[PDB]
């Protein structure tokens, strides 16, 4: 895949903190389908390193439990751009955020052979915030996405999105 | 939505013979999110009978099979406006066609709308049809959509969207 648009001007340490996973789109619908299926994953918060790294911790479900999980996230030359250390990298790609509202983010899947990419539009507040998916949506047309999800606020307040 | 112009003068023998399901839509995640949820379903043919009702042929994974499945659509007072007694829905709505490439409908159980509500594209043609997708995107924008699934030509072509 080519990713097209990632953040000019990313300050990372201005997304420390909570947030919430209001709505997700990967390029296979086998990627978000079930909720156990690999990329549906829901991010609850950012902590930037002071060495400019990013630590994402997550939720997921797994065995039918939800899981906790920490995914550190190492700065590259392209600042809007890190690499997950994991038996296989992956890439993690800011497209745009106003720091106080949303983020949006994409994800690939490299332990899949076949060209793979999850994007999510994360806001602050438990809230679905008509003008971040309307950021997400305009984001998501330049990208071959197969399969859509959003979250109601019910969703967002639970653990692992119920 | 309000009853539109293609909509009252809809003509349903128009729309007889070959579709695909390009597209699909729930207010449910749980409606549409496995191959054997309940409103996954993929339309092949429409055949309108002389007394105005609506046969729709379609495939839907059951069983560990690919079943094909006859619905018979009774017609209503509005034109647009089906009766069916199947996939535990009672409405089958069509919002638009040009009859000759693209042709947008939703099925829901009027008891309960929000937890019912499923809407596909259906094309002529085994393609991905960027302005039916288009057309298909604007209607859903007034919805209360929450999963959204797109299919690729090899997935058209196959049985069950393979």
Redesign the interface.
């Known amino acids: 895949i080519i990713v097209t648009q990632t953040m000019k001007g990313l300050d990372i340490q201005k997304v420390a903190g909570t947030w919430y996973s209001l709505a997700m789109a990967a390029s296979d ?1 086998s990627l978000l ?2 909720q156990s299926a690999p990329l549906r994953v829901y991010v609850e918060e950012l902590k930037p390193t002071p060495e400019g790294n990013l630590e994402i911790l997550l939720q997921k479900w797994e065995n039918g439990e939800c899981a906790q999980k920490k995914i550190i996230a190492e700065k590259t030359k392209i600042p809007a751009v890190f690499k997950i250390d994991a038996l296989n990298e992956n890439k993690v790609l800011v497209l745009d955020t106003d720091y106080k509202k949303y983020l949006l983010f994409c994800m690939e899947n490299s332990a899949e052979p076949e060209q793979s990419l999850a994007c999510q539009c994360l806001v602050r507040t438990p809230e679905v915030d008509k003008e971040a998916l309307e950021k997400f949506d305009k984001a998501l047309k330049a990208l071959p ?8 606020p019910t969703q967002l307040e639970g653990q692992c999105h119920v």
């Open positions: 619908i389908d079930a996405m197969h399969i859509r999800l959003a979250f109601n």
